[PDB]
Amino acid sequence: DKICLGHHAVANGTKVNTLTERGIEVVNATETVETTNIKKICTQGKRPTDLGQCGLLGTLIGPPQCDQFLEFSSDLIIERREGTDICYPGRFTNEESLRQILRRSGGIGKESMGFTYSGIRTNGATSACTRSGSSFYAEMKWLLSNSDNAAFPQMTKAYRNPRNKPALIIWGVHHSESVSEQTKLYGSGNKLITVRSSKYQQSFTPNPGARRIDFHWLLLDPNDTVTFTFNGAFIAPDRTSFFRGESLGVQSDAPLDSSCRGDCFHSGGTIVSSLPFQNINSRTVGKCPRYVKQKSLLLATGMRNVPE
Amino acid sequence: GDKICLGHHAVANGTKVNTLTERGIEVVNATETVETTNIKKICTQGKRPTDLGQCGLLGTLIGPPQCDQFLEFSSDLIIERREGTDICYPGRFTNEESLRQILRRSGGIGKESMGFTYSGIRTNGATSACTRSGSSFYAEMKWLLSNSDNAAFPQMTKAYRNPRNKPALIIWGVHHSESVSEQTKLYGSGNKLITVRSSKYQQSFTPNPGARRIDFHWLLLDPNDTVTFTFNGAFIAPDRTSFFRGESLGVQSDAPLDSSCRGDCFHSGGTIVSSLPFQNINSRTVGKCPRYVKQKSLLLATGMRNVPE
Amino acid sequence: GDKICLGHHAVANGTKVNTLTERGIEVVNATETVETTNIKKICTQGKRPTDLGQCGLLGTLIGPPQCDQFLEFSSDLIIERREGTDICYPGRFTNEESLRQILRRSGGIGKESMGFTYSGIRTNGATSACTRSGSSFYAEMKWLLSNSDNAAFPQMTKAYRNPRNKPALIIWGVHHSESVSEQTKLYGSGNKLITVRSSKYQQSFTPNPGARRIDFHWLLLDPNDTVTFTFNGAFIAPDRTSFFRGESLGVQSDAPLDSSCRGDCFHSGGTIVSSLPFQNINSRTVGKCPRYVKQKSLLLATGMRNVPEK
Amino acid sequence: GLFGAIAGFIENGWEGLINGWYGFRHQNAQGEGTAADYKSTQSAIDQITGKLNRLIGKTNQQFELIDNEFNEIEQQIGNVINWTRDAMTEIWSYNAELLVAMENQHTIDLADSEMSKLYERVKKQLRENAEEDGTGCFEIFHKCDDQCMESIRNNTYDHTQYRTESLQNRIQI
Amino acid sequence: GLFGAIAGFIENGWEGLINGWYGFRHQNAQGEGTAADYKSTQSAIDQITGKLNRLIGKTNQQFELIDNEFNEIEQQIGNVINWTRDAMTEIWSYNAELLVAMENQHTIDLADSEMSKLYERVKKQLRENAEEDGTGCFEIFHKCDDQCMESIRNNTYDHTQYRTESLQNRIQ
Amino acid sequence: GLFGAIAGFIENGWEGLINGWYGFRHQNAQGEGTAADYKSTQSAIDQITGKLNRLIGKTNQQFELIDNEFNEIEQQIGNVINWTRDAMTEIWSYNAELLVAMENQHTIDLADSEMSKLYERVKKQLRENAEEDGTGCFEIFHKCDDQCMESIRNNTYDHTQYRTESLQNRIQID
Ligand SMILES: *[C@@H]1O[C@H](CO)[C@@H](O[C@@H]2O[C@H](CO)[C@@H](O)[C@H](O)[C@H]2NC(C)=O)[C@H](O)[C@H]1NC(C)=O
Ligand SMILES: *[C@@H]1O[C@H](CO)[C@@H](O[C@@H]2O[C@H](CO)[C@@H](O)[C@H](O)[C@H]2NC(C)=O)[C@H](O)[C@H]1NC(C)=O
Ligand SMILES: *[C@@H]1O[C@H](CO)[C@@H](O[C@@H]2O[C@H](CO)[C@@H](O)[C@H](O)[C@H]2NC(C)=O)[C@H](O)[C@H]1NC(C)=O
Ligand SMILES: *[C@@H]1O[C@H](CO)[C@@H](O)[C@H](O)[C@H]1NC(C)=O
Ligand SMILES: *[C@@H]1O[C@H](CO)[C@@H](O)[C@H](O)[C@H]1NC(C)=O
Ligand SMILES: *[C@H]1O[C@H](CO)[C@@H](O)[C@H](O)[C@H]1NC(C)=O
C-alpha cells in the first residue's frame, strides 16, 4: 500500500521565458503587452471638440474655417490633418508653444478689449478671407489710413486684464505686397509697432514685398496692462482669450465614438487596456501603458508543465 | 518525554511591507527608502554661497545699481531669487537662458578693463531709470554720445585682445532711441552701423529708432583672439570684460540660507538631506540627489515574516 | 566501515563578485559584463567609408574648394574630422546641426542640375576666399548680381519642381554685403527682399549689410512639389540640388581608419568591438552599441560559491 | 526548479488531476484513487494572483503632445524628442523583458516549493510508518484503507495507531 | 516563505526570544528553557545589512538647472523638459517599487531559509536518537538534562552515547 | 546559500575535482576514489549558459549623435541634451548593477540547489541502508565494494540487496 504525491499537467502548455531558459513550457500564462487597438477616439464621458477644418490657432484670430470655434469648451481637443490656422498668408511666432498651451486650456472664452478708433479706418478686408464677399479675421481689426496714401497717426491703445486668470493677447503685423502698397494703406515712411506689458516689451517693423500677416502673442497677468503703440501695418485685437479649465489634446484621423470610454489616445485611435505595456503606438497622449518593442511578453501563471 | 524545539523570534506589532506576491504582509522590522523630510533652507555649510537677491544673474555682467556688489564675486553655490532683475533701462540679452546657464556654473566672475579710451566724443550717457545718486548707467558699460546735440559721431574702431588663458565674456549693447530725431540728437544724422568681429564671430547691428531700449549681445573670446568693434553711434561700449573662476552650482529658491547644515541636493523649497536612494519631496532638483519617485513610502524589510500569538 | 561523501569543486583563488546581500563574495568563475577595451581606430571592414578630412559635411552641399572631391559621394560610414570646414566666405547654415544629422544618415548625396538660366543679370559673382580654377565661388551655387555697378537688379522669379520620387535638399544663400555702399554697387539701390515658397515652407529674408557674410538656408522639397524663389538682389542661387542615397552612420573622430577589423559601434575615440551588454568607454556613440554605464567593472558569476580548503 | 520536486524527483505531472495544482494518488487493497489538495493549491494560486495584482490595473500618469504630426516642429528639438523617445522605449523594453523573465523564474520555483512543502509535510506525518521510494511516493508499511488514506490527506492521521504494526513490518527479512 | 519553516510547519514565532532571531526551546525533567542561536542569527543580519549597504549612502550624479522658474523659457522646450522629467519619474517609481518588492520577497525567504538550515542541522545532529514532531520539535528518546540540551545547541552532542538507550525507546 | 549545502553543511570544495561541478568521494576496503557527477553538473551549466545567452550577444540598440564635439551647439539645447544623457547613464548604471547583483545571487543559490538535489537523491537511494553524518557523507551499514559504490553513483543501487545486513548493523539492540 502506497500514497504518491504529485501535481497537475496539461497536454498543450504555453511557452514562456525565464532568466535561465527560453521557451520553457508552463501550465498557463497571461499576455502583458497590449496589441488590441480601437480605431476610434473614444469620447464617452467626455465633452469632445472635433476641430475639423479649423486649425487650433485659428480659434484665436477667427478665419472663416473657425467661425464655429471662436469660443469652444471641451476636455478633449481633436486636431485634424486638414485644419488651417490662417486665410491670408502668414504664421504665429512660437506657434507650437501656443498650440501646446491651447491643447490643455479646456477651451477658450472670448472677451472684448474695448478698443475704439477715430481718425482711421478699421474695415480692412481681403478676398483671401471670404465670408460672403471680402472680409477679415473675426477677432481682429485691420487698421488703415482714412484714404489712400494718407498719413496714419501715431496711436496708443491700452488694455488692463480685469479677470482673475491670464489673458491671451494676439496682434498682427501686416507685411505689405509692395513698398508702394504700404504707403497706400498707411502713411509714408518707417512703420513701428511696440507692444509692452509689465513683463514683456517688443518692437516690430513691417517687411514690405512679402504679402503676409504674422501674428504675435503674449500672456497678460491679472491686473496688468498691455500697451500697443503703432503708426501703421498693425492688426489690432478686438477680443482677448481666457482659458476655461483643463483639456487633453489629440492629433488623429480616427472618427469620434461616444459609445466607448478611453483615456489613452494616439493618431490611430484609443488604447483601452489594464495591461502594463502596449505595442500599438510609441507616440501616445493621456494615461497609457508604456510602449515596448516586443509584440508579446507572456507571464507564467502556472507551474512548469511536465506531461507523461 | 523530553523534547527540543526550534523557532524564531516575533514581535507583538510588526510592520506591513509589500512583496512581489503580497501587499501588506507583516515583517518584524522595516526601514524607509523614500525621503519625505525636507529642510526649508539652503544648506551652505562647507560651501561658498552667493545670494544674489535683487540682482539678476545677467546683471552681474553689465552692472545696474542692484548688482553693484556682485560685479566681481566668487562662489561654488549661486542662489537666484524671484526678485532678481537684470536691467534698469528697458532691453534684453540675446540668448539669455544660454548665458544664464554658463554663468551659474562659472564659479563666479572676475572683471578686467578692456583699455578703451575715447576722444572727440562724450562718455557719460545716463538715464533716470538707472539711479545710483541721480541719473546713472550700467557700471560695466559706457553710453557713447556726440560732443553736443546733433553733432556727427565719428567712425570708430575699438579692438581688444584676450590676454588670459581662458575665454573672455565680451558684452556690448545697441541703443534704440525713442525716436529718429532722438537718434539724431545723441549721434549724427544718418544710418548707424555697428559691426562686431572676432575670428569666430561676425555680426552687424542697426538701431531701430522708436523702440526706446538697449539690447545686449555677447560672445566668448578665445585666448589670444581679438574682438573688433566698428561703430558710428548707438553703441553701448564695454568698459570691462568677465572671466570665469572655476566651478559652481546654480540654484533657484525662496528658502533662506543656513550655514549650520550641510547639503548637496537643492530645490525650490530648500535642501534634501538624506542617504536614502529615493525622495518624494521635489521632482525638480539640482545637485547630487536621490531619485524622485511618486510614492510617499516604500518600506524595505529588515526582518523575517512576523507571526505572533 | 564504508562511507560515501557528496561534494563540489573548488579552486585555489576564485573571483570576487557582488550579490544583493554581499560585496566581494568569491565564486569559482566569473565573466566581465562591461566593455573597457577600445580600439583607437575606425574599423571600416565590410563597409564603404568616407573620410571627409578637410571638407565639412555641409560643405558637400554648397561646394567650397576643400569639398571638390565630395560633391557627390556614396557611403554607409561618414567620418567627420576636426579640421573639416563648410565654408570659404564667412557665413552660417541655419539649422546646421539638424542638417548634419540628416546628412549623416543619408547614405551619401547625388547632385542634379536645377535647370536655372538667367537673363538681364550677371552670374559670375566671385570671391578670393573660394579660389579654384580662377577666383571662383561655391561650386553648387551662383552669385547673381546686376549687369554693371549700381544697376537696378530686376524683380525675379525662379521655380523648380522636384521630378524624382524622393525629397530634394534645396539650398540657397542670402548675401550680407560689407556695407550699404557695397549692396548698392552689386544689386542696385533700395530695399532687398528674398522669398522662398514651397507647399509646406514659406520664409522671407532681408540682407543685413555691415558684415561680409553669406548665410545659407534650406528646405526638403517633396516629390512633385515646387519651390519658388522671388528676389531683387543679395541672392545666392542654387545651381544643383542634392538627393539622398539610403542608409549610413556619421561619426566625429580623429582616429585613423582601419580596413582590417569589423565594428558596428563608433565614437570619437575609435571603435568598440564587443558583445557585452554594457560599456564604460564613451557616453557618445553611434551605431549598434552596448549601453554606457559609469561602472568600470561588473563581474557576472558563472560558477558556484568558491570554498577552498582552509 | 530550485526545489527539485516538479521536473525533478517527481517524474511527471498528472493530466487527470483537474481539481487542483497538487494532490494525492494512493494504492491499496480497495484499488486506486486520486484526490487534490486545497491548502497547497490555494497557497500557490494566491501568490500568483498577487503578482497579477501588481502588474494589472496600474494607474498611469498623464503625458501630453510634445511634437506635431501635421506641421513639423523646429528640427533640432524634433531630433532631441526622437532621440529621447527611442532611449525611453529601449529602457521600457528592457524592463518589461526582465520583469517577465524574473517573475516567471520565481513563479516556477514557487510552485516547485509548494510541491516540496506538501511532500515534506506528509513525510513528517507518517513518522516511522512509511519509507519514501524516491519518486515522490510513500510506501506505507501497514494496511491503510480508503478511510486511512483520507486521514493522511486530512492531517488527522494518528501515527501511534499504526506504529507497532509498521515497525515490525520494516524489520522483517 | 519558499522553505516552509517560518509561517509554515512552525506555528508561530516567540515573543520571549529577545536575544536573537532564531533559537531553541527545551523541555526535560528540570523544566522549560529558551536560548538564542548566535550563528544563524548573525548569518541573517549580515545578509540584511548587505542589502542596506547597497541601497543606503550611494554617491549621486550632479544635475544642473535646465529650466527657469522665474523667467519662463519658451513653452516648446519647457514641455519637452517636462515630458522627460515625467518619463524619468515613471521609470524610477517603477524601479523603486520593483526593487523594494523584490528585495522584501528575498528577505522573507532568506530568513525562512536560515530557520530551515538550523532545523536541518539539528536533525542530522540527533541521528537515530530523536524523531521530528512535524511542528518544528524533536522528540528525544533518551533522558537529556540541561548539560545534554546545551551540547545539542552548540554542536558537541555525541549521538553514540545515547544510541542504545534511544533505539530501545523507539522500538516498542 | 539558501539551501545550506555549498558553504553550509559541506565544509569545503574539492580542488581535486577537476572533471565536474559535483562529485562523489568514497571510502571502502579497496581505498579512496573520486568521480564527477555528469547529470547534476550539466544541469547547473545549462542554466548558467542560459543566463549568458540572455545577456551576451544580445542585439544592441541603435545610436545616433545629437551633439557636436567640434562645433558646439547652442548652450540651452545642449544642456537639455546633457541632462537627458546623464539621466540615461543613471538609469542604465542602476539597471546594470542590479541585474548583475540579482543574477549572481540566483547563480549562487542555483548551484547550491543542484548540490542539495544530488545529496537528497542519494539519500532516498540508500533508503535504510545508510545514515547522514551531517557533513554531506553517508556512512553505509553494509560492505560496499567498488562496484557497489559505482551502482550508487550511476543510480542502479538496489537497496533490497543489502537491507538485511544493514538493519542488523544499524539496529544494535534486541
Ligand atoms: C489561462 O489563462 C487565461 C489568460 O491568459 C485565462 O483566461 C481568462 O479566463 C476567464 C474565464 O475564467 C475569462 O473571463 C477571461 O476573459 C480570460 N482572460 C483572458 C485574458 O483570456 C484562463 O482562465 C486560464 N485557463 C485556465 C484553464 O485556468
Ligand atoms: C513644466 O513644469 C513646471 C513645473 O510644474 C511648470 O511650472 C509650474 O506651473 C504650474 C502650473 O501652472 C505652477 O503651479 C507652478 O508654480 C509653476 N512653477 C514651478 C516652479 O513649479 C511649467 O509651467 C511647465 N512648463 C510648461 C511649458 O507648461
Ligand atoms: C555637454 O557635455 C559635453 C561633454 O561632457 C561638454 O563638452 C565638453 O566640455 C569639456 C569640458 O569643458 C571639453 O573639454 C570637451 O572638449 C567638450 N566636448 C566633449 C565631447 O567632451 C559640453 O560643453 C556640454 N554642453 C554644454 C552646453 O555645456
Ligand atoms: C571562466 O570564465 C572565463 C571568462 O571570464 C573563460 O575564459 C573560461 O572559459 C571560463 N572557464 C574556466 C574553466 O576558466
Ligand atoms: C521624428 O520622428 C518622426 C516620426 O517617426 C518623423 O516623422 C520625423 O521626421 C522625426 N523628426 C525629425 C526632426 O527628424
Ligand atoms: C528597526 O528599524 C526601525 C525603523 O527603521 C528602527 O527605528 C529600529 O531601531 C529597528 N528595530 C530594532 C529592534 O532594532
Author numbering:
A (entry chain C): 11 to 142, 144 to 158, 158A, 158B, 159 to 220, 229 to 261, 263 to 276, 276A, ...
B (entry chain E), C (entry chain A): 10 to 142, 144 to 158, 158A, 158B, 159 to 220, 229 to 261, 263 to 276, 276A, ...
D (entry chain D): 1 to 173
E (entry chain F): 1 to 172
F (entry chain B): 1 to 174
Give the exact sentences the study uses for this entry.
The two membrane glycoproteins on the surface of influenza A virus, hemagglutinin (HA), which functions as the receptor binding and membrane fusion glycoprotein in cell entry, and neuraminidase (NA), which functions as the receptor destroying enzyme in virus release, form the basis for defining subtypes. Hemagglutinin binds to sialic acid (SA) glycans present on host cell surfaces. Here we report a detailed molecular analysis of the RBS of the HA from North American lineage H7N2 virus, NY107, including glycan microarray analyses and structural analyses of the HA in complex with an avian receptor analog (3′-Sialyl-N-acetyllactosamine, 3′SLN) and two human receptor analogs (6′-Sialyl-N-acetyllactosamine, 6′SLN; Sialyllacto-N-tetraose b, LSTb). The overall structure of NY107 is similar to other reported HA structures with a globular head containing the RBS and vestigial esterase domain, and a membrane proximal domain with its distinctive, central helical stalk and HA1/HA2 cleavage site.
By using x-ray crystallography, the structure of H7 HA from the NY107 virus was determined to 2.6 Å resolution. Although five asparagine-linked glycosylation sites are predicted in the NY107 HA monomer, interpretable electron density was observed at only two sites, Asn38 in HA1 and Asn82 in HA2 (all residue numbers are based on H3 numbering). At these sites, only one or two N-acetyl glucosamines could be interpreted. NY107 is regarded as a low pathogenic virus, and as expected, was produced in the HA0 form. However, subsequent digestion with thrombin protease to remove the His-tag resulted in cleavage to a profile on SDS-PAGE comparable to that of an HA1/HA2 form. As expected, NY107 HA is structurally very similar to the Avian-H7 in all comparisons and closely related to H3, the other group 2 members used in the analyses. Although the NY107 RBS is similar to other subtypes (H1, H2, H3, H5, and H9), a previously observed specific feature of H7 HAs, is also observed in the NY107 150-loop region: two residues inserted at position 158 result in this loop protruding more than 6Å towards the binding site compared to other subtype HAs. More interestingly, the eight amino acid deletion, only found in the North American lineage H7s, from position 221 to 228, resulted in a complete loss of the 220-loop. Sequence alignment shows that Arg220 and Arg229 are conserved in all influenza A HA subtypes, but structural alignment of NY107 HA shows Arg220 occupying the Gly228 position, and the much shorter loop turns at residue Pro217. Indeed, due to the absence of 220-loop in the NY107 HA structure, the “aperture” of the RBS formed by 220-loop and 130-loop in regular HAs is increased by ∼10 Å, so that the branched, internal, and perhaps more complicated glycans might be accommodated more efficiently.
